Every structure is written in C-alpha cells, then in structure tokens.
Amino acid sequence: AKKMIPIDDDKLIMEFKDDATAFDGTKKARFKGKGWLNAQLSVIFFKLLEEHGIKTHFIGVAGGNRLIVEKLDMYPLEVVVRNVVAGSLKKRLPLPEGYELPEPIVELYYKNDELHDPMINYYHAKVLGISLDEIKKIEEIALKVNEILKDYLAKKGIILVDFKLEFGKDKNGDIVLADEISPDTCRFWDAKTKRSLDKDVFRFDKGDLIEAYKEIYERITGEKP
Amino acid sequence: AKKMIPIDDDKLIMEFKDDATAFDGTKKARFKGKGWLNAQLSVIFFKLLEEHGIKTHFIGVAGGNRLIVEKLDMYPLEVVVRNVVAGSLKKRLPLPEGYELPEPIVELYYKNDELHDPMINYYHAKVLGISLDEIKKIEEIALKVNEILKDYLAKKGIILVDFKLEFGKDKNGDIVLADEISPDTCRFWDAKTKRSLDKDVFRFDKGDLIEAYKEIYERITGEKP
Numbered sequence: 001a002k003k004m005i006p007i008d009d010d011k012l013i014m015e016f017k018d019d020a021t022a023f024d025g026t027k028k029a030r031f032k033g034k035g036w037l038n039a040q041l042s043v044i045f046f047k048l049l050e051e052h053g054i055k056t057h058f059i060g061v062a063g064g065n066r067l068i069v070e071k072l073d074m075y076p077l078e079v080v081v082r083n084v085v086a087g088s089l090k091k092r093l094p095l096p097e098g099y100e101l102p103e104p105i106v107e108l109y110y111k112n113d114e115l116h117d118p119m120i121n122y123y124h125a126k127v128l129g130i131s132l133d134e135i136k137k138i139e140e141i142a143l144k145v146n147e148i149l150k151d152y153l154a155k156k157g158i159i160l161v162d163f164k165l166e167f168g169k170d171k172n173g174d175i176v177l178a179d180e181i182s183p184d185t186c187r188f189w190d191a192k193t194k195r196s197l198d199k200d201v202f203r204f205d206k207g208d209l210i211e212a213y214k215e216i217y218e219r220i221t222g223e224k225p
Numbered sequence: 226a227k228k229m230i231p232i233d234d235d236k237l238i239m240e241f242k243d244d245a246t247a248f249d250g251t252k253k254a255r256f257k258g259k260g261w262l263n264a265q266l267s268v269i270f271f272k273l274l275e276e277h278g279i280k281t282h283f284i285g286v287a288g289g290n291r292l293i294v295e296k297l298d299m300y301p302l303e304v305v306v307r308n309v310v311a312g313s314l315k316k317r318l319p320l321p322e323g324y325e326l327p328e329p330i331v332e333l334y335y336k337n338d339e340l341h342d343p344m345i346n347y348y349h350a351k352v353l354g355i356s357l358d359e360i361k362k363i364e365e366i367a368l369k370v371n372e373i374l375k376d377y378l379a380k381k382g383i384i385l386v387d388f389k390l391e392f393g394k395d396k397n398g399d400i401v402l403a404d405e406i407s408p409d410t411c412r413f414w415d416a417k418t419k420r421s422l423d424k425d426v427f428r429f430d431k432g433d434l435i436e437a438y439k440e441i442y443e444r445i446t447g448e449k450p
C-alpha cells in the first residue's frame with residue numbers, strides 16, 4: 001500500500017498506492033483513489049498531532065499521493081492502541097465486539113515477516129535492543145495520540161475504536177511518530193450506527209471501501225474529495 | 226494431572242495424578258509414578274523457596290501424591306519465566322533453540338479455556354481486574370523465584386531453561402505462589418548434553434518420561450526414588 005523513495009540523507013518520499021491487502025497479504029484488491037485518500041488523511045492527522053506537540057516525521061507534501069518525511073531509524077514495532085473491543089482483541093479477552101474498555105489498551109507487535117508480526121511485551125522488546133525507558137516513552141506518546149485523535153473524531157461523530165502506530169529515532173535520539181495514520185491503520189465507527197468507515201469494509205466485505213474512505217474524508221474536512 | 230479437594234475454609238488437598246497431556250490436551254498418556262515424582266519435587270521446590278523468603282501455599286504433605294495447601298483467591302494467570310530460548314519463544318523472537326537470553330523474559334498468559342490461554346500484557350491484565358501494582362509484585366516474585374531455582378539447579382548440573390508459575394491472593398491480600406513446580410511445569414536441561422529432563426520428553430517423544438523424571442529427582446535429592 002506504500003512506496004518509500006530516498007531523497008538525500010535527511011528525508012525520503014512516502015508514496016501511498018491504491019493497493020489493499022488483508023489477512024497477512026493473502027487477500028488483494030486495488031481501489032482507485034485509495035492512495036490519495038490515505039495520503040491526505042495522514043497529512044491531516046500529522047498536522048493535528050504536531051499542533052498538539054507530538055513529534056512526527058511529516059515534513060511536507062510532494063503532490064498527489066506523496067509525502068515528504070523525515071528519515072528515521074525505525075523501531076521494529078507496531079504499537080496498537082485500543083478503546084473499543086474489535087478484531088484480534090476478541091481472541092485475548094472474553095468480551096464482545098463493541099465492548100467499551102474501562103481504559104485504553106496498548107499492545108506491542110514485533111514487525112517481522114518470518115514470524116508474522118507476533119505480539120510481544122517489554123521483556124522481548126529489551127532482547128530486541130529496545131530499553132524499558134524507550135518503550136515507556138513510546139507508550140506515553142501513543143496514549144497521548146489516542147486522546148487527541150479520539151476527542152477530535154468524537155466531535156465529528158466518529159468513534160476511534162483502535163489504531164496502529166509506528167515510531168523511529170531521529171538524529172538527536174528523540175522518539176518520532178512515523179509511517180501513516182489512515183483508515184488502513186485505524187478502526188473508525190459511525191457513533192450512531194456503529195458501522196465501519198475503514199479497512200474492515202474491505203477485510204469483511206462490509207460494502208464499498210472507497211465510499212467509506214470518502215465519507216471519513218468528508219466528515220473530517222467538511223469538503224468533498 | 227492434578228485434583229483439588231477442599232478441606233475447610235482455610236485449606237485444600239492438592240493431589241498429583243499419573244496423567245499427562247500436551248498440545249492443548251490433544252495428546253494423552255498415563256505414567257505410573259509421575260504423580261509421586263511431581264508431588265515430591267513440588268515439595269522440595271516450595272521448601273527451598275520458603276527458606277528464601279518466598280510466600281508459597283505449601284502447608285504440608287498428606288501422604289503419597291497429596292499436598293496440603295493454603296486456599297487462595299487465584300489470579301487467572303500463568304506467569305512464565307524464560308532464561309534460554311525454547312518452546313513457544315521461538316515464534317516470538319528470531320532466535321534458535323538454546324540461545325542464552327541476555328536477561329530473563331517474563332510472559333503473562335491469561336488462564337482461559339475458551340481462548341486457549343492467550344498471551345496478555347499489563348493492560349489486558351488491568352481490564353481483567355489486576356492492577357499494575359499487583360502485576361509488578363507478581364513479576365518481582367517470579368524473577369526472584371527464577372534466581373533461586375536457577376542457582377540451586379546450576380550447582381546440580383541442570384539448566385533451568387524456562388518455567389511456569391501461578392499465584393493467588395491470601396486473606397491478608399498478600400500475593401502467594403501457588404499450583405505446582407515440577408518437570409511438568411519447567412524445562413530442565415542437562416548442563417553437558419543439553420538434553421531434556423522434563424515434560425518435553427513426552428511432548429516430543431525424546432525418550433522415557435519416568436526415567437527423565439527419576440533422573441531429575443535423583444540429581445536433586447542424591448537419593449533413588
């Protein structure tokens with residue numbers, strides 16, 4: 001769903017593609033316009049977060065589906081924040097889809113193809129070279145990101161169910177939010193109907209992906225795509 | 226592999242059976258004498274730990290395969306401490322069987338049949354009603370148990386590879402070590418040959434289980450069963 005093109009030493013191009021995959025890449029389709037939607041929405045979220053004092057890798061836009069971002073030394077993690085029970089969480093807790101959590105859950109996943117991104121804890125992370133201090137800073141940022149995104153979306157009648165973040169280290173050794181934030185990497189439910197406005201539409205054939213992504217875009221920006 | 230028989234309000238009987246199961250109970254066999262070996266070895270480990278200031282549920286012995294233990298409000302957890310890469314850890318870290326960890330790993334598993342004992346972290350635990358303070362005390366005890374067992378066994382030419390503990394709360398709200406500690410719930414390797422003296426012998430047909438358990442017993446006690 002994304003291509004990364006180096007520029008110099010400091011920055012690279014992050015290009016969003018129309019490709020979609022699910023179930024460990026076993027399900028595939030292409031959706032015209034998805035790259036554009038995901039690019040734009042990432043820009044809006046990064047800008048929101050930056051205003052709130054979150055260090056992100058966003059530098060600028062390079063026309064269309066491409067963003068200019070800061071090159072980072074990436075942590076091999078997917079950091080998942082969860083507010084409402086959905087997806088894989090139903091296999092860890094005996095709780096129904098839609099259950100409102102008493103407080104957010106943060107999950108760590110090790111980004112590894114050989115192993116299919118297994119869940120890990122702080123101890124595995126330490127073995128992978130990530131200190132407890134670093135994990136703690138990462139979860140602190142993720143939880144702050146959760147607060148900002150969920151408040152901002154709740155005002156627009158969207159429940160932030162759960163979402164995935166990734167992080168890297170900059171040249172000062174600061175922890176910087178990286179990758180993307182889009183309906184590919186979040187669960188968004190309509191506050192009223194509880195219906196998915198995200199990649200779950202493609203994952204489980206809940207309707208047309210592009211329509212759902214357009215709706216999200218419109219409900220956030222007030223403008224048509 | 227064990228039966229629990231209530232006595233009064235304060236205590237129950239923990240009886241060790243000759244039954245063995247593996248792979249989520251799908252593989253089954255019976256080994257004459259296993260109950261006795263596991264009972265005795267649990268007694269030896271609990272006594273060792275008690276001398277070292279670990280609060281356990283051990284009260285006494287009730288002849289043969291039965292122990293008298295303190296009734297506790299059990300945490301729904303299996304707490305796994307790991308020193309050497311083996312078993313399921315090979316699916317979380319790209320490291321070979323026998324890799325020596327730079328420091329111990331503690332893993333939490335939610336004791337739940339519906340869900341087949343999934344791994345969890347501190348956040349899931351909080352949702353299950355287990356405070357961060359409690360998790361922290363539990364991991365502190367487990368790591369202390371690790372130190373004592375590994376030192377004690379290393380002197381006898383046995384590597385403590387990994388092991389599983391369980392815990393409950395007593396009437397004072399103290400966290401007490403519970404269940405069993407036996408070759409069913411630990412990995413024990415000969416320091417020289419690196420060969421299994423534990424349930425892995427049954428799990429993977431590495432030889433005769435009873436012989437392996439007898440050997441452990443003999444190497445710990447200096448006496449024949």
Ligand SMILES: Nc1ncnc2c1ncn2[C@@H]1O[C@H](COP(=O)(O)OP(=O)(O)O)[C@@H](O)[C@H]1O
Pocket residue numbers: 001002003004057069070071072073074166168178179180
């Ligand atoms: N600022 C950055 N600097 C360096 N690498 C990044 C940055 N942001 C994202 N990446 C990495 O680029 C890759 C993006 O490709 P892709 O596999 O499509 O995304 P992901 O796997 O993260 O969903 C990922 O490995 C991601 O960690």
Ligand SMILES: Nc1ncnc2c1ncn2[C@@H]1O[C@H](COP(=O)(O)OP(=O)(O)O)[C@@H](O)[C@H]1O
Pocket residue numbers: 226227228229282294295296297298299391393403404405
């Ligand atoms: N001191 C104790 N008080 C109350 N329950 C206990 C105590 N020690 C162990 N138990 C519980 O008794 C059960 C033992 O049965 P079994 O299923 O054979 O063992 P386990 O499932 O723990 O391997 C477990 O649910 C265990 O948590």
Ligand SMILES: Cc1cn([C@H]2C[C@H](O)[C@@H](COP(=O)(O)O)O2)c(=O)[nH]c1=O
Pocket residue numbers: 080086087088089162163164184185186187
């Ligand atoms: C598995 C996976 C989930 N996610 C996101 C989608 C969901 O919003 C959230 C939790 O997903 P899960 O329910 O599959 O664990 O993380 C990704 O962005 N990439 C992935 O590869």
Ligand SMILES: Cc1cn([C@H]2C[C@H](O)[C@@H](COP(=O)(O)O)O2)c(=O)[nH]c1=O
Pocket residue numbers: 305311312313314387388389409410411412
């Ligand atoms: C799965 C499981 C493991 N264990 C023990 C055996 C191993 O010593 C240790 C780690 O096992 P694992 O490698 O299967 O995760 O925990 C149990 O006692 N009971 C169990 O049900």
Ligand SMILES: N[C@@H](CC(=O)O)C(=O)O
Pocket residue numbers: 021022023024025203
């Ligand atoms: N459906 C997942 C892939 C997976 O389950 O591995 C996704 O978000 O792409």
Ligand SMILES: N[C@@H](CC(=O)O)C(=O)O
Pocket residue numbers: 246247248249250428
């Ligand atoms: N083999 C495991 C069972 C499992 O894998 O679920 C055991 O220790 O009994």
